[PDB]
Symmetry: D2
Subunit: 416 residues, 4 copies
């Protein structure tokens, strides 16, 4: 204890005057290859709209809510006001955007905050889309409209403690009963699960021994989703462990499209493209912050940006960014032309996430001390990126998916 | 909100049964080149003692206190029971260890927790040692005995918001008054400062225009140290912003050894060696955890350690570790023989911290999902390492110190 | 000596049957993101034409001539038959291609052989273009037609032993005499110089103290260009040391466009873009070879492409390639739109050359033993790439050019 | 053709005066951690002796013979005068050195030239040692004395075109005949084979279906060893393809120790340690050259060693070197204490060779243009290192050997 131990933290205005925190978000200096040429007039407008609605409403409060690992619920309606939820889904009260537009949207969110980016992505590109492609016409018209407006929040539940990367061999059972199903099993890592209204839980149809999709409602008897604590990244994203004991799902709430796991590998085709755009966004932000910081912070009687070592670090980031964008952009134009294959998308996410790590690592050390402060974005984004490298297919798995497709030989399984 | 939103987190026994958390700390499988051969019988005994007293008393509680960013005060006496505080200092109620022993001690702490390692290092190798080398015989006999037993905690205050890497050009003034001094200025990043009894504050002697050392007592009128929040690493270490308004320091509490900043560069010679040993420790822990995890966690019907990609990652870590140790060991044997130069020590810290990052980065991705959980050590240590890469001389500064010494040409300042 | 010491090398058919050498060049499996979409119908046709005319006429003989470090002169007319020399130059008997087309042309040459790529690039993009932009209408109509058909070969002479990266401070003097000039000085590294008909030598106009361009004819009295030996890369490219003792250049053969070094920085704008495309080409070839080799060579009772470690290496190359291409492609579309700046082009070359090294390094180790054989392309290209990383602006210089432009602060000069 | 095309290359004194070539070899500035402390008085004397006898007799001529890919036979007796051949072998006219001494000897050779280092290593650590451990007392007393003096040269023949990394499944047959054996099969990559007096050829004992060792004499009827051309590294090392048609080996010339391939894995235990020391040596040389070059070559009105970017590159090399040495040193002290295991040695070679590549890559780019010239060592050593990364167990194989030992699970074979 001390007479000054209880006193509130020093204001950033007094504690470190030389540099401007992320509270007032940096200008877009990462767009060095003038990317608006690769975007359509409408895509450009969505890009600008999201960017502004993020620097205004999320940028100030994000620093506080990340430390507390609490979700900023009062921001939800502001995100549904951007018109991004639903994204790729056409009709059913959804914006109906192009894959390039829905991707550049994700970017300009992850740029300011990766946490709020994953929240929407899991809800929109995994939750909503699964209903939009595998659901029935009765389900699409029922749920989607409210989900696109963010009045109701959905979550995607494929992963288990026992089965992660080997997702196709999951152990949650879906026993057929009169009038519906009884879902029994456990889930781990599901974002939004602790507060989600709709829980798209994947389970094993005990009759067919195949994987089926189920829309599980909130608070449903036998369902218990508890918060996963102590995350170093994506701290605002409420990830949880789901328990399922005789959870009833009526025949009307089973997804008719999912009848094996191969059916899921059409939703993932969009999901993998969209996740691939998160690092593209994050890295841009990391640069934008570094560019300003190195120009504001003075040491040895000169801005940091004047020193050879710092410049080489900055341009390596700038170079990594330009390539990462073009990579993700091309990936979209492959999906749009309808000639995109699992391997191309798996290469996309893997490569981009890898260079994003390098870019984040350089950015983090460039700010030195304040490089470990979430006040200055880079530190938060450095941490925020680590799960992204792993989730939606770990680097190693993706590189092996692209491996299998190109070589023609599968090398996933062990020897034995 | 939800009926299950408020419910406590799922126990690790139920949430993820396949793997054992850091609560029960991993066995020492990182010692692959059998390092006990490089240590003396007495050094070996200190190594073992600390390791055990860390896996017992810190290992269980560390996960909880890291998330809360709170210091575990009830552990303090247990650390002072290890007989590590003081370390290199001979006499004055200190253990009187060899530089190799005091280094291997730091390692086996940082191995289990980097936070508690920095706490002691700043207290012992920076605080206590400054008094031991630059203090008067009257000061050494007065403070050191209590500081070695951890009844009183000391902190080192050189860095400022305006002056960080350019430490020799600091702006905290030490105006001479009748009977003592009036310290005026600001400090940033000082570990333990918020609860430290002794504050070794460096200020500019306004009469000589040189840097002098001052022992500032706790609660002293005009002194205000506030906690720095939102750190991604070393979260338990209470780092703070120090304010100083006409803080009186009597003539008896001025360090007579510090007459310019060059005098400090004899304390730093030990401090830089000791910090260099933190990554060596941390990385060993990161390995020990990975080795078990890859052997416990099963996927695709085999332990993770069976897959080619995972093995190459693991052995790269094992290789990085063996070299890091030998590097730090040699560094000690250079200081011990008395032929160590600033450049050698600067190369030591820089190189080791660099490979520690690589080792931590691999380790973090090896655990996949649980790679972002502080429950599993790696994530915490991954974050914990980032400030260490920067503090006690940033990588770039150190590489330039070694640069200046070898080439003969100084390349720190800008052009202009 | 031995009874078998003098005997000719074993045929590749008997010495290593499992794999096919570069003699029969690999199919295009590096084009994974289907790049023909980014090219125009005419650009596609040039791409195909060059690729075929390289796999037929150069691919067999390249292995032999690289080892001997001799230029394949009997291939010259076959290269001038492709219609690539001149490239960007409109009229004057030149093909008049787009910057994207002239870039994709360079790629499909460097793909098969980097040596023959540099030969043409130095001749066309540096030699011919300098005349086309800085020469007089009388000079353009006189030389260019024959240079485009490869009946006459030109070389570019800016670099000196004393002045390399600091090119603007060169020491070759151009003393004004009656009716012309007397060029005095030394040059180093000039490709084609030993056999070039036209030598575009840059010298210092002693009257204005500025840099001027001079067309020096072959065999001119006082001129002596000797071959530089012992190169590990670009061995077929005849690089030489040029000596100049009172070499007369008539007033008609002075380039009227070059009156300071700033005038050169418009030719370099194309030259830097074109060099940036060499690694893009080379790396594609390196992949194409690896993809086949890993599928042909069998070990442990399976093709190399079946092993996890080898796949991860291959896909990292494939990923590096797709990005490198998009990067160079975008760079062209920046020059084409006329909004390209020195910094963007400097980022292009730097980044691409850097990833090309990584890609080459992986490719070289993938072939193992035969990875050091020029018979198998990769080894040759691995070596061939090293000068490219350095010449046309070293990585460090380029990263500093992009540094200066973005930050606004120049950090080229030393302290002192 | 030209009047100056046939003229001999420009002397290095005139062509590039600013820097000193490798002809006059650089001073030892790579020994930054003062390594003579880790060596015995006798080891120090051997280190110095070899270093001097290399800088005098090999250093001038190496540049010429590397380009021509010819072996400098007139240097052989000078190498046998150093007293290094035999090395570890006790008695039988061999020097009888310690493993640490024989390793530091290899280093100080590979430092000046890697080619001459491999020549001796294959002869001494693979050839001679195989006889010393697996040969009979009659064979040791017969061959070794002459082999240690370098009057006779031996070579090691395990690898085949069909079987490389999978060495234990080789296909050279050893059919038993009256009075001896008939060796039938093919070999590839054998150093010295084209001029070696003794050819230690490994073949499959057709009776036991196991691997046996055979001493095949030079010029033996049915034996034909042809030179392998077009190598980018170790160009002086005469590597060859061996043909064997009914080559008779009398019962007296069969190695009685080699009864299966497991017996070989005691010779390799020394061979792998010794190869591991080649990069340690090479990298030291690469540094020593860079340190001088960056201090001699001036650009922008300052030595290259004055620029931040160049210093960071240089110290990364210096750091990589100090660790590489300690790593190899520790490895020796593990073999010496008799507690070294295949995995430790496999980690040694793998890790060291990996960092040697990094160190060589940096060194090569530091010299810029002259970084591709064998005149300046770095380029030659950069190339020379590439096979070393692969031969004596490729990086991937070694990392998997260390993988198997630590994890307990073997991951060499494919699935299928
Ligand atoms: C958690 C933690 C605990 C700490 N505890 C203490 C403590 O107890 N006591 C104490 O005194 N200090 C402490 N520090 C502060 C630390 O000493 C400083 O952060 C560091 O020494 C200087 O970095 P900076 O924050 O001032 O950033 P800067 O000095 O501004 O450096 C930022 C970046 O600029 C680069 N740079 C700076 N100068 C040059 C140059 N000349 N040439 C090329 N590049 C350059 C650096 O490489 C760095 O990446 C602590 C820091 C941390 C993170
Ligand atoms: C914060 C975050 C949010 C998440 N949100 C969701 C969500 O909303 N919905 C959802 O369904 N999931 C979610 N996940 C879970 C995620 O999908 C899984 O973590 C991941 O797909 C599988 O990793 P794992 O945790 O099971 O570790 P593992 O699958 O056990 O993998 C651990 C390591 O082993 C390696 N490995 C595994 N198999 C092989 C192999 N065959 N060959 C070589 N190496 C192999 C991997 O490379 C990895 O490094 C989230 C995860 C995180 C971190
Ligand atoms: C100049 C030089 C000198 C040599 N001298 C000798 C000599 O004197 N005596 C002698 O006996 N040999 C010698 N060798 C041969 C050497 O031993 C072999 O090259 C090497 O051991 C096997 O490599 P390889 O050429 O057969 O390629 P491969 O064995 O086919 O390997 C190619 C690639 O495949 C990868 N790979 C192979 N198996 C696996 C697997 N199971 N899992 C994952 N990846 C795998 C490797 O990592 C490698 O990158 C020499 C080689 C060179 C280059
Ligand atoms: C095979 C090949 C072909 C070539 N062909 C031609 C040709 O046809 N025409 C022609 O004109 N030239 C040619 N060149 C020469 C080439 O342009 C020069 O090599 C290069 O531009 C300058 O490098 P340098 O050799 O002078 O080394 P240096 O300029 O001395 O550079 C050496 C190192 O110092 C570093 N360095 C230099 N200055 C700085 C600084 N200010 N700050 C930080 N680091 C610095 C660099 O990064 C580099 O690593 C060729 C070179 C090669 C290798």
């Amino acid at each position: 204890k001390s007479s000054y131990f209880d006193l509130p933290p020093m204001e950033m205005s007094v504690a470190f005057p030389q540099a401007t925190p992320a509270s007032t978000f940096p200008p877009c200096t990462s767009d060095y290859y003038h990317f608006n040429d690769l975007l359509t007039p409408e895509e450009q407008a969505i890009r600008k709209k999201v960017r502004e609605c993020m620097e205004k409403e999320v940028a100030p409060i994000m620093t506080e809510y990340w430390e507390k690992a609490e979700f900023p619920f009062h921001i939800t309606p502001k995100l549904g006001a951007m018109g991004v939820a639903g994204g790729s889904i056409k009709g059913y009260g959804c914006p109906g955007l192009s894959i390039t537009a829905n991707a550049i949207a994700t970017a300009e969110i992850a740029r300011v905050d990766a946490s709020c980016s994953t929240f929407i992505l899991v809800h929109s590109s995994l939750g909503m889309l699964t209903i939009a492609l595998c659901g029935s016409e009765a389900q699409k018209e029922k749920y989607l409209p409210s989900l696109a407006q963010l009045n109701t929040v959905a979550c995607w539940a494929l992963t288990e403690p026992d089965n992660g990367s080997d997702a196709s061999g999951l152990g949650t059972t879906a026993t057929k009963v009169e009038g519906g199903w009884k879902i029994n099993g456990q889930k781990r890592w599901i974002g939004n699960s602790t507060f989600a209204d709709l829980l798209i839980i994947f389970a094993r149809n005990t009759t067919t021994n195949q994987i089926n999709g189920f829309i599980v409602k909130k608070d449903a008897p036998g369902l218990k989703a508890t918060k996963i604590p102590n995350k170093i990244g994506l701290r605002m994203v409420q990830n949880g462990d789901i328990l399922l004991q005789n959870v009833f799902v009526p025949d009307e709430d089973r997804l008719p499209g999912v009848n094996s796991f191969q059916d899921t590998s059409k939703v993932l085709a969009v999901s993998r493209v969209m996740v691939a755009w998160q690092p593209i966004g994050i890295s841009m932000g990391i640069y934008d912050m570094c560019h300003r910081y190195l120009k504001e912070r003075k040491q040895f009687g000169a801005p940091l940006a004047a020193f050879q070592l710092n410049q080489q670090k900055l341009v390596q980031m700038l170079g990594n960014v330009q390539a990462m964008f073009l990579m993700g952009w091309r990936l979209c134009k492959l999906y749009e032309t309808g000639q995109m294959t699992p391997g191309q998308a798996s290469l996309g996410k893997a490569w981009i996430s890898s260079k994003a790590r390098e870019t984040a690592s350089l950015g983090r050390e460039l700010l030195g001390g304040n490089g470990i402060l979430a006040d200055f974005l880079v530190a938060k984004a450095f941490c925020d990126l680590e799960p992204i490298y792993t989730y939606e297919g770990t680097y190693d798995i993706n590189t092996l998916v692209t491996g299998r497709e190109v070589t023609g030989i599968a090398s996933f399984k062990p020897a034995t």
